[PDB]
Design a protein around this ligand. Sequence first.
Ligand code: CLA
Ligand code: CLA
Ligand code: CLA
Ligand SMILES: CC1=C(/C=C/C(C)=C/C=C/C(C)=C/C=C/C=C(C)/C=C/C=C(C)/C=C/C2=C(C)CCCC2(C)C)C(C)(C)CCC1
Ligand SMILES: CC1=C(/C=C/C(C)=C/C=C/C(C)=C/C=C/C=C(C)/C=C/C=C(C)/C=C/C2=C(C)CCCC2(C)C)C(C)(C)CCC1
Ligand SMILES: CC1=C(C/C=C(\C)CCC[C@H](C)CCC[C@H](C)CCCC(C)C)C(=O)c2ccccc2C1=O
Lengths: 80, 37, 119, 152, 732, 107, 68
Amino acid sequence: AHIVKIYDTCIGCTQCVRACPLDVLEMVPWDGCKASQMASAPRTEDCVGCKRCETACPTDFLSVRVYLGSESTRSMGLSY
Amino acid sequence: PFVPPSWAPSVFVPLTGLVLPAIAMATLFVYIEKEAP
Amino acid sequence: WYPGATAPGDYGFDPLRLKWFREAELTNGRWAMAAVVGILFTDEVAVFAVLEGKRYEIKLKELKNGRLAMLAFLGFCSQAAVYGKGPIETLQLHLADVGPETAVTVAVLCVLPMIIEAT
Amino acid sequence: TWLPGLNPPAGDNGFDPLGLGQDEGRLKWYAEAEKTNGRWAMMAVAGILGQELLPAWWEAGAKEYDIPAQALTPIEFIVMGFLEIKRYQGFNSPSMATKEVKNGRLAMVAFIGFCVQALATRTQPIEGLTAHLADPFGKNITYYLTHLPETL
Amino acid sequence: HKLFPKFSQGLAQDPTTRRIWYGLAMAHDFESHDGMTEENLYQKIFASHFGQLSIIFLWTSGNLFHVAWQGNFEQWVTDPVHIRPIAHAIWDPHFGQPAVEAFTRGGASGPVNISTSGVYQWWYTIGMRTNQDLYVGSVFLALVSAIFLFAGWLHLQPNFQPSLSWFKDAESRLNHHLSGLFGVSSLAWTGHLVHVAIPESRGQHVGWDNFLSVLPHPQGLTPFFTGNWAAYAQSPDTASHVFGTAQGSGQAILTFLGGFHPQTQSLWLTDMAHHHLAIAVIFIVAGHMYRTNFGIGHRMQAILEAHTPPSGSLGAGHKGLFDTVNNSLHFQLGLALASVGTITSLVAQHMYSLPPYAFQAIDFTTQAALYTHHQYIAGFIMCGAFAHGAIFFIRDYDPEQNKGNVLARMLDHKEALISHLSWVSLFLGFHTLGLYVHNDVMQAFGTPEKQILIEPVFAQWIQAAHGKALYGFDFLLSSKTSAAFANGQSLWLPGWLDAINNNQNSLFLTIGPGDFLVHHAIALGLHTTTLILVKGALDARGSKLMPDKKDFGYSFPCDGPGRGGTCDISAYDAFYLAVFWMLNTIGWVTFYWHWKHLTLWQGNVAQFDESSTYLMGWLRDYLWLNSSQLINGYNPFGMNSLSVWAWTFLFGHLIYATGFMFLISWRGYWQELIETLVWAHEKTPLANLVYWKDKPVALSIVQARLVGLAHFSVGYIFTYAAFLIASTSGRF
Amino acid sequence: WLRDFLWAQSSQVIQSYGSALSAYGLIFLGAHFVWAFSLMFLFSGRGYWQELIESIVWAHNKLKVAPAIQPRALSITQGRAVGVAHYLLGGIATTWSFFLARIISVG
Amino acid sequence: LDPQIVISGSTAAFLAIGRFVFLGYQRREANIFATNDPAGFNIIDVAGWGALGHAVGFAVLAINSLQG
Ligand code: CLA
Ligand code: CLA
Ligand code: CLA
Ligand SMILES: CC1=C(/C=C/C(C)=C/C=C/C(C)=C/C=C/C=C(C)/C=C/C=C(C)/C=C/C2=C(C)CCCC2(C)C)C(C)(C)CCC1
Ligand SMILES: CC1=C(/C=C/C(C)=C/C=C/C(C)=C/C=C/C=C(C)/C=C/C=C(C)/C=C/C2=C(C)CCCC2(C)C)C(C)(C)CCC1
Ligand SMILES: CC1=C(C/C=C(\C)CCC[C@H](C)CCC[C@H](C)CCCC(C)C)C(=O)c2ccccc2C1=O
């Protein structure tokens, strides 16, 4: 499984969520930003580690981070 | 009493060339593919 | 099998770390007993396959004499390939009045029962 | 106190200037080791003094023997293996104990004296004794190290 | 899941073929295994070290045994000028009778290999004369290898595992390794030289039978205890001494002569004896410096805390460095690899120029092979030093323990460091390539008198300072009225002057504008490789493109196509890019070494001095010219003894080329190809009864870089080894 | 092929200096150079180069010569494109010089 | 020469000089276990300063043997 973390610099722009090709991330209620939204990664067992979320994140530095970890059949994107 | 005999490459070179690589690759293959309990 | 040895015709000797191995020990012992009797008393395809297939598809003294005959057959092959003589001739040269390996092997072997005790 | 002022840390004379016996069971092992090195040294000194009196002790192994010395080592290893194994699987007055320890220590020092002394003088040790008695001042360790060519 | 690998269940739960490769690759990285503590780390490293020692002594015993059984050592020592040293016999049933006749050279029964490792010269100089001696040495070193393998197994056992305090004791280890491992070993080798190796060169056999009854000197130990130590320098070996015999001999055991023995063209055994005795005393004295359990001695942490200069120009100085060298194994490993790599360069540079062994430097293929062998070893070890330094920065470096010291201030001016390395690399590259291209245009347009030929006046000044009367500077050792000349003139300068003014050896070769241009290209390679390695070490914690590079580790693939794309951003990848510059730089230094020595050995150094100043002269007169007998090793008219080197030459070109496939083409192409292969196998009838246990996948990105660099490097090494051995041996 | 074709027929190109065919020797060497120069782009990646450019940009900032148009490493695809273009140019021009020098001198 | 005189005088000079003028500096920089000496000049101090004495004495003997 790959380690996906969300950091408090998130501005709830939802760009990472609409960039993930696997439905791993989602938006939760929060109070830390004006959008009152925060990303969250409850399904990192299906994460392949493509880093589209990191490409989509606008903040400097990143508020979503993907640490490539141990490989499984779902994280390697295998259909066989 | 040190010199190995005149037939010695004819046995020792195909031994470590073929037989020990076959045994070693078979043993390492069975060790790789072994299931954990 | 040695004074002070512990266990992991059995004697607790397993330095390298089962029922197939016991059956293989028994059949190597039986064929070595027949071969040692043939070498001491010295001086076809499909039927053998059928007998072997029927044997595959199918009490201390047996493996005692079997281990003794396996060591005996190793003895025949070794002191025939080294001495160039038969067993009676090597016995006669032994009686009535690879050396480094033999000496090194024995000492090393003894260092070996000692080492296990240490560890 | 081997030199006074130094108490023994934890034939005891407080002599461990390297700290080799700072562990209890390890020190018990070294005590047994000192005992057996001293026993073999006592037997060796009695051997050299006996053989000399009733070929030197360094040229003794190469004369001629029954087997000969090719195939006598495995007999030695088997017999000494049985004896040693028995001793390890096994492993009266304290005056006799301290005499045994100090006697083994003096025999170890005497045997390294035999080895170095014979290797530097090319004499049997009773000839070294009669040389040092016939000439105390002279024929000392200075003579055999500065006049080494004469002995060869 | 599966058992292999036992050190990582994260890899053991991998359903693919990636598990096998990553178990092979992460096996000896003990800091990242499951359940690894620090004591266990040091203990397994200690056992692995014993394993390395056992393998080295088994390697040496095997060299001794194969020489003693299949070589011509006892026949070589009778005339070591005209007889070739046999390595080992050939048993290849794939041969034909012309190949058996071709590799049956002489004087041997069957097919043999001719050794280029220098072991006959080394063994003959240290006193071997017979094959039995080599048999005894082989049996002794095999027994030593068994003892070290047993000692690794023993120090793994729980009654013998050392604690962490034993491994972290630096003063005791430096005192015992300086005084005992350097000093007493060098003293005992001096004993071997004096007792055996000098009388074997005098023609007197001193074996184990009579080493107690043969005097090393006719007055033994009486000068040594009187202090009359100059009595061992009296009557040295005459300049008409035949080596290994008694004609023209002397009585001295410790001289200081300089230069070379006249017949063997090699260093004097008495000078090497004196040399090992002096450095033995110096290492034993230096091994009493540090504070063990005896009150006296230096305290290294106290020395480091003291050496901080005033005015804050180094900040906190060396404060807190003892707990960062002591606690980090990667710092110690990088220091050890930097030192051993520089010393391996020193070994190669000093052994071509000052040949130690008898009838070395007349075996030209041995000279070239040993130089090239230790230069490539040195290059790999230097790259590993910088690699493990970057690993130190990522894993072991604590910034709060180093707040203000020299190691933090290097990270503070890392941009200035990389900027000035970039400047020196660009400068040397522009002007070295511009001068070579300029001279090529001059040589092409028929005008060699216009080409820029800068004279190497600085290194010629240094050679004149060393005593070479060619360049007419005439100062400090070249002028007869100098203080250094007059003070060293009575004792060691008369041999050194003759050897440096001989132009028939490698002792301070005559240099010119080609040598200028190549030393500049060498500086380009060194500065550039240092640029990539220092950039990878100092950008390992992070850069502006990736501030959190320390959070991914040392060897991660990339950080994706975002932020413009980040390919080869890791410090491992900077190492990977710098191995190419290492191979380039050592290829330059060994092309230069080999061509200047081939023109010395043939006789026309004018050929090198003319053709070395332009790269077409390089390509025409070295690579095209010296590979004429190589590629004729086999042909449609027959074959000869060079056919193995022709085959290995093409073999290296092939492995190099196969490495380019992993280097250029990357992963997802092969992953799609393998997915179509998986479809084809699962749909093919009567072959889909056979199924894989490990799911086939394409090689990962990092693995691809490693496999491509491995094939690239092996092909590079085999191609230049085949060319160098075949050209030197075929033409000499 | 290595001996009787490449090595044997490369004589004319390698000894073309001092004559009218010397340009074919120059373009032989130049083409070898360009081919090799492509390997840096094909074998490397733009992350390293971007960080190197960062250090150099720092050096330019120190002397007030950092450009307003920000120095960036080439894209991944442009690295591949530059790589294959210099690779093709180098190899093809090499065989061009070999062929022309060979066939003009022995023709 | 006079080897006993040179070695004994050099060892006496180095032991006396480390006993009397460098002992306090060695105790300042360092900051078997018990001796009768009033300065604590123990066996290891004797070993170090006599080692320097023997080394310098044999160096002087060797240079005078070379006659340089
Ligand atoms: C890593 C790969 C590598 C390989 C394969 C080689 C291979 C070689 N080296 Mg090179 N070398 C290397 C790296 C390597 N080297 C490095 C990293 C250095 C710098 C440290 C050197 C420095 C070096 C020198 C200076 C020399 C060589 C030589 C050689 C050649 C002879 C074989 C040999 O070394 O005998 C095996 C060596 C041993 C088994 C050890 C020798 C004995 C050691 C030094 C001391 C033993 C002390 C003793 C045990 C103590 C007893 C104490 C007493 C009181 C009991 C062989 C081609 C020699 C040569 O070129 O000959 C023609 C040569 O003179 N090498
Ligand atoms: C003193 C010697 C020494 C020691 C004790 C270590 C120890 C270590 N190194 Mg270091 N290093 C060294 C020298 C050393 N290194 C040298 C000389 C180099 C330059 C090559 C390096 C460069 C280096 C890098 C880049 C890395 C390490 C890593 C490591 C760690 C893990 C090793 C591992 O698991 O790989 C297992 C070893 C292999 C899988 C070897 C694969 C085979 C290689 C590619 C060569 C293949 C050529 C083949 C044999 C030729 C066949 C030809 C054919 C025709 C027969 C371990 C701490 C790694 C690390 O710390 O990770 C964070 C790591 O990434 N080392
Ligand atoms: C012949 C092949 C070749 C050449 C010439 C270079 C040259 C260079 N490399 Mg590269 N490299 C190569 C192969 C090569 N490399 C390979 C195979 C790899 C493995 C991937 C690398 C990996 C690598 C790394 C990791 C690094 C380098 C770096 C460098 C630069 C180091 C500084 C220097 O000396 O620049 C001198 C400049 C030159 C040699 C270029 C010549 C300039 C030309 C002649 C000017 C224009 C001429 C003409 C007008 C052109 C007109 C054509 C028209 C169509 C425009 C240098 C430009 C370093 C760097 O970039 O530092 C800043 C660096 O860190 N290289
Ligand atoms: C990254 C890193 C690392 C690494 C580093 C390295 C790898 C380095 C290298 C380095 C080096 C590799 C260096 C070198 C140096 C050298 C020198 C410093 C030299 C000197 C010399 C001299 C000084 C000499 C002089 C002389 C002469 C010239 C002549 C005469 C004689 C005499 C002697 C006088 C580490 C680990 C730390 C960690 C951190 C990170
Ligand atoms: C008690 C006392 C006293 C006395 C003292 C004395 C008398 C002392 C002495 C002391 C001594 C008398 C010491 C000594 C020491 C010595 C030593 C410690 C040595 C060492 C040596 C060495 C180390 C050497 C080395 C070497 C060699 C071996 C070889 C060659 C080289 C050399 C030289 C390096 C008095 C009266 C004053 C006062 C009172 C008290
Ligand atoms: C060298 C290299 C670079 C660095 C090269 C860069 C950034 C381009 C350099 C081209 C020129 C030199 C810069 C543009 C010059 C300007 C027009 C300035 C004016 C110059 C005057 C003389 C006209 C990469 O960015 C890269 C990316 C991906 C894979 C491989 C590589 C790669 O190999």
